[PDB]
C-alpha cells in the first residue's frame, strides 16, 4: 500500500518515510502501473537493484569477496564501497547490477573504524596514548603506504581501552575516505616515542550503512541462495539484500509525477509540470534524490531551484540529473 495516493507516515519504508512532511506542489497525478515500491519488486528486479551490507572476513581481498558474491547470486555485475585491506573486517557495501551506479558515492563517503594499535614498549604515563590520539585528530598529513604526501581528515576519535602490559590500545575513529589507519598507528607510535603499528582493524561504518544496519555474512549470502534454489522461498534473499534506496535515505527528496518519470530518465531534467512534492530546505545546487510516488530512486540530481522558488515559480527546470539510477524504460514514454 506504501504508494502516495493520487488524492502519520513515519512507518512508511525507506524514501517515503515521513513523506507527509514534503511540501505539496500538486495534490493529484495520474497513476501508472509501471515499476514497484522497492520492497515489493519481483525477485529479479529486487536483486538487480540490491545492496548487501557485508561483514567482510579477514584474509580475502575486497575484490575476491565481491567475486564470490557474484558467483553465488549468479548476477551480472558487482562493485563495492571502498577497499578494505585483506586482513581488515567489517562493513563492505556490495552493490549488485543497477545498484553499481551508486558505487562512486559510496567509495567517496566517510568511514568509521575500530582499530587496535600495538605499541612497541610500555608507556610510563598510560594517559599519553589518549593525548596523542587527540593530537592526531583533524586534517592530518599522511603519506600513503610513487607515493605523495597528502592531507586527510580524522573528524573524531575516541580511546575505548588500553592495556599497557599487553601494549594494545583499541580506539574508534571517524574519517574522510582515503585516511589510512595503518599510517595513523605508526604516527601514534612516533608521537609516543615508543613506536607502534596497526595490530588489527575493523570498518564499522561505510557511508550510509553501519555494522548495525542489517549486516550479513558471506555464509548468509550462500545460505540465502541455497534456500531459494532448493525451496524457492525468497524470504532469506529478501532479508539479506536491501534496496539501493537504502543508500539514499539522507538525501532531500523531490517526488516526480508518474507521467514525467520516463522524461527525467532520458532528458536529464525535471520541469515544473513534473513536480509533485519537494523537501523543505533545498537550496540551489544541493544534491538531492528524485523519487517516484512509489518511492523508487529515479536519480541523484542537482537542485536548480530552492524550496522557496519551487513554491512560487510557474515554469522552468527544477532539477538536473547528475546520475540516473532507474532503468530508462521502466516507466512508459509519453510519446
Amino acid at each position: 500500500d506504501f504508494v502516495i495516493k493520487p488524492e502519520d507516515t513515519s512507518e512508511w519504508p525507506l524514501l517515503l518515510k515521513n513523506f507527509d512532511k514534503l511540501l505539496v506542489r500538486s495534490g493529484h497525478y495520474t497513476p501508472i502501473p509501471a515499476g514497484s515500491s522497492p520492497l515489493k519488486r519481483d525477485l529479479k528486479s529486487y536483486i538487480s537493484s540490491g545492496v548487501i551490507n557485508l561483514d567482510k572476513p579477514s584474509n580475502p581481498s575486497s575484490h575476491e569477496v565481491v567475486a564470490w558474491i557474484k558467483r553465488i547470486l549468479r548476477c551480472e555485475k558487482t562493485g563495492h564501497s571502498g577497499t578494505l585491506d585483506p586482513k581488515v573486517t567489517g562493513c563492505l557495501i556490495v552493490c549488485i547490477d543497477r545498484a553499481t551506479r551508486l558505487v562512486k558515492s559510496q567509495q567517496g563517503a566517510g568511514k568509521e573504524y575500530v582499530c587496535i594499535v600495538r605499541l612497541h614498549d610500555a608507556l610510563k604515563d598510560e594517559k599519553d596514548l589518549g593525548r596523542s590520539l587527540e593530537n592526531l585528530t583533524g586534517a592530518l598529513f599522511q603519506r600513503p603506504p610513487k607515493r605523495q604526501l597528502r592531507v586527510r581528515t580524522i573528524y573524531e576519535s575516541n580511546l575505548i581501552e588500553f592495556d599497557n602490559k599487553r601494549n594494545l590500545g583499541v580506539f574508534w575513529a571517524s574519517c574522510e575516505a582515503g585516511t589510512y589507519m595503518r599510517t595513523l598507528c605508526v604516527h601514534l607510535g612516533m608521537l609516543l616515542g615508543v613506536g607502534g603499528h596497526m595490530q588489527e582493524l575493523r570498518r564499522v561504518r561505510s557511508g550510509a550503512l553501519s555494522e548495525n544496519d542489517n549486516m550479513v555474512t558471506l555464509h548468509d549470502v550462500m545460505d540465502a541462495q541455497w534456500v531459494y534454489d532448493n525451496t524457492r522461498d525468497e524470504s532469506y534473499l529478501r532479508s539479506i539484500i536491501q534496496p539501493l534506496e537504502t543508500l539514499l535515505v539522507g538525501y532531500k527528496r523531490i517526488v516526480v509525477k508518474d507521467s514525467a518519470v520516463n522524461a527525467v530518465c532520458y532528458g536529464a531534467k525535471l520541469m515544473i509540470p513534473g513536480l509533485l512534492r519537494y523537501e523543505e530546505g533545498i537550496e540551489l545546487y544541493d544534491e538531492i534524490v528524485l523519487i517516484t510516488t512509489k518511492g523508487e530512486a529515479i536519480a541523484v540530481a542537482i537542485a536548480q531551484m530552492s524550496t522557496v522558488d519551487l513554491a512560487s515559480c510557474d515554469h522552468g527546470v527544477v532539477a538536473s540529473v547528475k546520475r540516473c539510477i532507474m532503468e530508462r524504460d521502466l516507466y512508459p514514454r509519453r510519446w
Binding site: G138, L140, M190
Partner: protein, 92 residues
C-alpha cells in the same frame, strides 16, 4: 654547506633510532631533505612527515655516527630554504 639554513624542527624525543621533531617552520620539508645543526653539520634527512595542519611533526633518519639519543628537548634542527614547500600545495 648551504649558504643559509632555516629553523625547521625542535627536538621532541627519539623513536626507534629516528629523531622526532615538532616543526618550527611555516612550510613543509621535502622528503629526504638534508637536516642540519645550527653550525650546518648535516645530521640526517627528513623521513616521515605527520601531525595536524597547525602542529606538524617530522622524523629525521640519522646519518652515519649520529645518535638520536644524544639530543635533548628543544635542541634545534635546520633546513635549506630550497627544500621547503608552502602548505597550500597540500590543500584545496
Amino acid at each position: 654547506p648551504p649558504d643559509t639554513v632555516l629553523e625547521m624542527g625542535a627536538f621532541l624525543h627519539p623513536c626507534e633510532g629516528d629523531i622526532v621533531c615538532r616543526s618550527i617552520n611555516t612550510k613543509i620539508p621535502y622528503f629526504n631533505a638534508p637536516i642540519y645543526l645550527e653550525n650546518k653539520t648535516q645530521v640526517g634527512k627528513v623521513d616521515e612527515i605527520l601531525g595536524p595542519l597547525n602542529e606538524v611533526f617530522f622524523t629525521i633518519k640519522c646519518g652515519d655516527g649520529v645518535q638520536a639519543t644524544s639530543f635533548k628537548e628543544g635542541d634545534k634542527f635546520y633546513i635549506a630554504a630550497d627544500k621547503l614547500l608552502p602548505i597550500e600545495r597540500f590543500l584545496p
